[PDB]
Each structure stands twice: as C-alpha cells, then as structure tokens.
Amino acid sequence: NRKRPVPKGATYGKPTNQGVNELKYQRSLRATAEERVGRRAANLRVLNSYWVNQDSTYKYFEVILVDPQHKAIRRDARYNWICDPVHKHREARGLTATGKKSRGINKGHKFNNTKAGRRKTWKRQNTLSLWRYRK
Amino acid sequence: VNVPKTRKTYCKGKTCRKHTQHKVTQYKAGKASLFAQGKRRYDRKQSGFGGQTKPVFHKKAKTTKKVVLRLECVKCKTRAQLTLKRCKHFELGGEKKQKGQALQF
Amino acid sequence: GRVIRNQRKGAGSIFTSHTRLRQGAAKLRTLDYAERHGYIRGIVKQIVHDS
Amino acid sequence: VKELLKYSNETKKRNFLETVELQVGLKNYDPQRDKRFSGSLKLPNCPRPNMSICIFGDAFDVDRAKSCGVDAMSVDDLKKLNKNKKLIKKLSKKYNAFIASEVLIKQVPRLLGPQLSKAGKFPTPVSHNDDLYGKVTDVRSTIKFQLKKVLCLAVAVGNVEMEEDVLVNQILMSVNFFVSLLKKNWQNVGSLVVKSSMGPAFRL
Amino acid sequence: GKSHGYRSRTRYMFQRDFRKHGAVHLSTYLKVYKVGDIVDIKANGSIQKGMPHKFYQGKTGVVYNVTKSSVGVIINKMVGNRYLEKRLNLRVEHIKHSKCRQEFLE
RNA sequence: CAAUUUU
RNA sequence: GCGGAUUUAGCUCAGUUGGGAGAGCGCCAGACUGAAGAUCUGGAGGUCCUGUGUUCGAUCCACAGAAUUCGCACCA
RNA sequence: GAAGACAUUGUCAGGUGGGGAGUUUGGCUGGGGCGGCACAUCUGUUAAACGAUAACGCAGAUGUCCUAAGGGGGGCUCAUGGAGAACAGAAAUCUCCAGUAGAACAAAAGGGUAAAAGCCCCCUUGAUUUUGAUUUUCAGUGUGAAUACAAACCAUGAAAGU
RNA sequence: UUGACAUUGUGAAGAGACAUAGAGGGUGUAGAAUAAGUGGGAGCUUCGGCGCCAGUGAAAUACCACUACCUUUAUAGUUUC
Ligand SMILES: [Zn+2]
C-alpha cells in the first residue's frame, strides 16, 4: 500500500478520512516504474514497459526506451514521430498503456466520467455557459 | 393475559369467504437477513473509514411490545394477522379462568 | 497533550553523549589464526582514567 | 431405483433350507432422538400378509360377530371378564372393541409386564372393522416408536417372486419418507437390508 | 400537564336533572325527524352512545340525514374569523323540536 | 496423641 | 438479542445409569464426672428452581418458563 | 562464521490502544445550578352560569389489568339496620321485616345504571372483514380516542332487536 | 500482539481424530436366566437348545440378514499436529 506522511499519524480532519495505513494510491504500480527510470536518463524517451518477475518485495519490470537523438531514429521514418517535442517525458502526462488504463480511457457505457480525462468531463459539465441572447 | 385456542374467526381466502375455524400462534421475526437490499445499502456505506453512519438507538422506554397472533387456518392452510393490545405477560396455553373457589389462603 | 520527557530522548537533540573525552573503542582482539591455534602476547604500556 | 433388478426376489430364493416360510425383519438407520417431537407412527398400507401363524386372543362386541367366520375365527362375546392374568400369552398384536374405553382398568392391574392386557402405553383399539378386521391374515406388525430406531418393514415369504414384489417395499415405506422432513437427519434416501432369517444379503 | 379531555368541565353539564333519575319516558321515540326542520341539542347522561361534545349544548340546527336510530344536524360554530358547517351524528334521545318557528308557521 | 477449671 | 451456567434440609455444603433423600451448625432431649466446661448419640429436616412430556419405574432425563450469570453481537 | 524454511517483508483478519484525532455535554425556571417535570395525557377546582382561558397554583392519576372483568339471553336485588336459633360469641350461618342506592361496577375523580350497566346460571368469540364519513384538541394538517353508518359473514335471543 | 496466505525449498520419525475386517461390557422378586439392547414368532440344527406351547420377567426363549454407544480394541484409507 502507501502510507500518507502525516507526522505521528494524526490527520487533523473529520473522521471520514482519518486512517493512514490502507490508502492505496490511485495510479498503477507498473506506472511508478518509469518516473524513477526517466529521471535516471532524462535524455531518452520511455516507450513502454512489461512485467518480468515478482518476488515478495520487488515487482521487476523492464522499460523499453529509445534515443530520440540517435539519427537512425530521426531518419528512418517508421519511428521519427517520437522525436516530436510534444512527447517529451511521455509518461508523467499519462500516455503509455501502463498509464492509459490508470487514467481509465476507453469508450463505452461504462466510462462516462472519463473518456477525455476526468477533469475535462468534470469541467464541461458544470461550467455555466451563457449566451448573449438569453437561452 | 389468557388467550384460548381455536378462535373461529372470519376467514377471507377465495374459497370460503366466511367463518371457518383457525388455530392461534404468536411468532418471531426471524433472522434479519444477509444479502437483502437495505442491508446492502448499509455495508456499502459503513465500509471504509469514518464508521457508524446511520443512528444507533439508546434511549428505550417500552416495557412490552404489542404481542400479535397468527390465525392459521385448516381448509386451505392459509393464515392471517391479528393484533391485540400490548401485554407484558402473554399466557397462550390453556389454564382456564375458572370460578376461583378458594383463593390459596 | 504535549510530547513526554522520556520521548524526547529518541532524536539526539541534547540527549546525546559527551564525546571529546571518551578516548577509545573499549573492544578486544579481532579473532585471527594466532588466537585460534597458539598465542601472541603483548605488553601493556600504561593504564589511564576513562571518561 | 434401488431394488429394481435383484437382492430382494431373485437372489433370495437360492439359499433357502427351511421348509417353513420366512418372515422378513428389517435393518435400517433412521436418526431421530430423545426430542419427543418426531415419533415414528403412521403405520403404512397393508396389501398382502407375511405368513401368519398367531391366533388372536381377545373378545368381541363387533357388529360382524353375527358372521365372524369369514376370515377370522375367534367368536367369544365381551362378557368374559375374570379370565386374564396368566393363562394365555399367544397374543402380541390384537384387536379390541369400542366398549373397552370404559371398563379397562379391571383386567390390567397386576399383569402389567408381559402384555396380557392393553394399557395406556400400548393402546391398539380400532373402530375400522372391515379392512383390518376383514383381512385377518394381515398381521399388523408395528413400526411403533422406540426412543432410538424401529425400522421393521417386511416384504414377503420365501415363495414370492419379483413381479409380486413390485409394490411391496416401494409404497409401504411411506413411514420413513413422509415423517422425514427438514428435521430429519440421515436417509432421505435409504441404506437397505433385505433378508429374513437364514442366509446372506447385501447392506448397501 | 394540562388536562383537557373529552368530558372536561362537564361535572354539571351531563347530570340527570335532579328528581328525574329514571329511564327515558316513551313520548321520545315516536316522533319522526324528516330533513328540513329545526332541532336543538340537550345532552343525555343516562345513555352514553352517540353523545356529542359539550360545546353543542343548547345550540340548534337543521337535520340533513336520518339513519337507523340516529339523525345528523348541521351547526354554525365560531372559530376565528369564519363559520363552519359542522356534521355530527346524534342518537335520537338528545334531540327535540323547538317551539321557535312554528310561531312563524301559525 | 484431646486436657482445661474447681471459692 | 445470541451461546452456556446456578436455584435443596432453616443457614452451609451434595452425591443420584433413571429402580436410595446425601454431612455439619441454630433449637431440644439423653449420657460420661464429684460438679462444670469442652466431648458423645438421637430428636425438629423439604411444590426437592416452577412446570409439562418421555420411557416397564421422575429429588434428579427431554423440551418450555421466572430469579442471577458470564463471554459475543449491535442500521429503526 | 552463526541462524535457516521459523523469523523478516507484503496483504487481509480479530484483540489491545485518551498515546493521539474529531464531536456533544436537553428544555422549563421569580438569576443559574440543585430539587421537581408543571415537556405527552386524564378527573375535579382556580374559570368571572355558551365556549376558550394562566402560574414551579390546588388535590389526585397513567405508561398497566381482562377469554372474562368482552357479546347476548334468562333468573335475583344491594350497603346497612331491626327481630329471633344449640355450641355461637363486637365478627360465621338461617329466616322475616324496613330499605332511591346511602352498595357494587379492574385501576384517580367525576358523571351513569335497580325486573340494571350490579349479583348468579346458560350460549359463544363482533377483541371478525372491506374500505369511507363525522366529533374533541385542530392551522379546523396528523396521530390517539370515540360516534353514526354501508356491504359481507357470524354469535345471541323464541323474537323484536342488540 | 495473535491467525491465514505468499516469498518457501529438498527427506524421514511418530501422535490424535475422521476412516474400517472387526473383538467384546450389563441391579435384585419371577422368566430358565437373575436381564441393554431390536422384531417378525419356528425351526434350523453331527447336538434336540428352547421345541414358537404354558412355564414368566422390563419388551421372550431358540435364534439372524445382525438389529446396543455396537469401545475395550488391534488394521489397511483419507486428512494430519
Ligand atoms: Zn381459511
């Protein structure tokens, strides 16, 4: 799990969120194995990960990474699209399928409160919008 | 109080629709339930932290609780409901209230 | 209430030792081949007051 | 179906060495307890006998005593009173009149043990005087409740074949499958024993 | 608490009008009450059934309904700043004909 | 081995 | 509210397979010595938790109920 | 070198936990607490002869009881007191005689009832079923209580009727 | 703090229960017996045991497919501490 920091464990709130020891970190633990591998080599673009091994303490992973500067990738147009500067640190904005499902993005009759992000569908549905002719 | 048995009341049914002869029992309200509906809207809400959403009840005043008689029939094994007044000792068996001749001295 | 007096000893605040006199590791020989199959004898040079 | 092919009527007529016929006791394990709630009464239907030799030992005020020679043969009217302490014990299952709701303390009182007059702890008396009383080869051997286990349903003698024994054990087992309900323990379906007195059998 | 029941303050309102402690006298049950005539309410202590409340004492109205052994009267009553028609079912012992408006007839 | 008074 | 436990001589203790009323102290009698005082025997012991039912045979069992109980469980 | 599938680590489950965390800690009231409940109800009175009408005013009461103490029908008349009978007496039972209630009616106090609504005997379970209207508190909202009904079926009576 | 599960592998000792060929305990009076079991009631048996007959006890007797917890208990089988 995770343990919210809270010095000596007294969250100073109402009792509805009082405990500390079984709050469970709403993004995925495969996705936490990239920010602590992206910062080790910030000059490379994280492509994707995959599970490999699992003991009782260390969920092992690999992460496939690409040099965006090695000009066999800047040429050879099958993978030049990751050299684009929108994809810089492509993980922490939630873009790999490790993070796509943590954001919970598909379409259907299930995912109403998330199909473009759960902050746009929050924002478009409760902004009052007023026309200059009062409809 | 004493209540005798066999209590021939107006049955209703759809077979007789007049006075046919029953027999009397009281009941118990059974276990509450698991997997019901309103309980599923309790252990969905008392889950997690916080605890104790819906009010518990401490201040009690009633002595007895309005004992009730099932009138179960014979002709088709239907039954019915009845509610006499509240009673803190409900004697259901025989024990005929006779002409008490001597009064135990 | 407040934190208690016997709980402020646990962070090295002012409750640490006083160390610029205590002049050595009062520990004996790291076991070797000599102390397992013979001996190696030494002299003392002096005895000192501790701190 | 648990007795359909054999073990009741085909491999029982191979081991018999008594010339005389055989009267089939039963072994089966129905669990009921000291909780006197679910006693083993409602004795079953009676289509066919099991080799009567007993001669019934009572006296009659029956409307059929004008013609009490049809299938029974015992005709003494009620007015024997003082002839029952010790002389006759050839009487285990009997009949009775409806007059004996009145006088029956008189021939009981010291003969309490060996069942030589009826009492409150085994009352027979019957007012049904055509079926049970007009078929007197019907020995009404009881399935009466003792505190642990009375399973004594019989079938036939050692001369009765398979087609005659299609009805005999199958509907006369109505005791242990109409009393046995949610209260009942073991044998919603049975664990049977089929042999009378002589040879081997199969306890499934 | 404060005791305002149903028979409250009717100590003398329902007594049997002293030296007439007896049953009803049978000139009472023979006269009929068709709808459309004035009647007034004088209570009856010996009987208990069908008895009105103590306010309808001496008040008067017209009959709108006749039943097996009872009639019904309508009564105007002050409550605040309007009058109400009131419907009340009285058995026949309480109720006589008043001599106010057959002077108007004669 | 139980055991203490007695004008 | 669930599950288990207790209810006797008058006070205090207890055995009964289900084929017997189990010990002492208050009261009373007798004895032993020269009289006491201790000591001895016998007498005065029972809705036997209140029932009901069971089996050939209920002071003791089965089921039910009133006084006390210990843990447990709490959505009007 | 020790220790070795037990410890440790992770998840779930009971127990322990003012060490901490959050929150309440009735209302009336001759100041507040304290005492009482006058906070929900009922009888009489205060109440000034329709009704309504207050005080921590007065004297009391309730959180129950009843298969009969409900329903019906039939027979009888009570509290007392007088006159007399063996044990019999201030207090026993049996007659006769007066006797408007001075008695009894579950439970506070009023009202009511005499071929009874009281005291005895007989017959039962209307203490049933469907849903509406009406009265008193009332804003003429509701709970509780009661009243006249309609339709069914029952009980009782011989019957009117209840 | 205490259980379970996982990290967690490789081999043996035995213990108690589930589990099964099963062995075998019993208060007067009378039965025959001096008695816990369950029932039809008559024979099977080298025996004539009781003959089912009355003899009498708490239900019969001899007798059986086994009807007593079928305990007292050695054994193959499960899981097992
Ligand atoms: Zn019915």
GROMACS .gro file of C-alpha atoms in nm, chain A residues 65-114:
model
   50
   65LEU     CA    1   1.346   0.328  -2.418
   66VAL     CA    2   1.454   0.498  -2.739
   67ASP     CA    3   1.720   0.759  -2.801
   68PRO     CA    4   1.527   1.042  -2.971
   69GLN     CA    5   1.852   1.194  -3.093
   70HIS     CA    6   2.031   0.894  -3.247
   71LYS     CA    7   1.978   0.992  -3.606
   72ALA     CA    8   1.888   0.645  -3.726
   73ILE     CA    9   1.565   0.723  -3.535
   74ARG     CA   10   1.549   1.081  -3.657
   75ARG     CA   11   1.582   0.934  -4.004
   76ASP     CA   12   1.407   0.606  -4.097
   77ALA     CA   13   1.055   0.748  -4.069
   78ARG     CA   14   0.891   0.443  -3.909
   79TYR     CA   15   0.973   0.583  -3.562
   80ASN     CA   16   1.054   0.950  -3.620
   81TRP     CA   17   0.725   1.055  -3.456
   82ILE     CA   18   0.867   1.016  -3.105
   83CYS     CA   19   1.130   1.279  -3.186
   84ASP     CA   20   0.845   1.533  -3.182
   85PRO     CA   21   0.859   1.770  -2.882
   86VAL     CA   22   0.504   1.703  -2.762
   87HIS     CA   23   0.618   1.359  -2.636
   88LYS     CA   24   0.892   1.493  -2.408
   89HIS     CA   25   0.869   1.291  -2.084
   90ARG     CA   26   0.582   1.095  -2.234
   91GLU     CA   27   0.497   0.909  -1.910
   92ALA     CA   28   0.402   1.161  -1.643
   93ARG     CA   29   0.123   1.312  -1.855
   94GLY     CA   30  -0.024   0.961  -1.872
   95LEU     CA   31   0.034   0.832  -2.225
   96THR     CA   32   0.166   0.475  -2.222
   97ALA     CA   33  -0.082   0.189  -2.183
   98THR     CA   34   0.064   0.144  -1.837
   99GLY     CA   35  -0.089   0.485  -1.772
  100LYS     CA   36  -0.375   0.487  -2.025
  101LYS     CA   37  -0.572   0.237  -1.818
  102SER     CA   38  -0.471   0.409  -1.495
  103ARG     CA   39  -0.643   0.713  -1.639
  104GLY     CA   40  -0.914   0.469  -1.748
  105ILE     CA   41  -0.955   0.567  -2.113
  106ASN     CA   42  -1.174   0.369  -2.344
  107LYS     CA   43  -1.523   0.435  -2.476
  108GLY     CA   44  -1.845   0.266  -2.379
  109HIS     CA   45  -2.145   0.269  -2.150
  110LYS     CA   46  -1.908   0.221  -1.859
  111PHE     CA   47  -1.660   0.508  -1.878
  112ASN     CA   48  -1.885   0.814  -1.863
  113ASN     CA   49  -1.678   1.018  -1.619
  114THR     CA   50  -1.359   0.951  -1.822
   0.00000   0.00000   0.00000
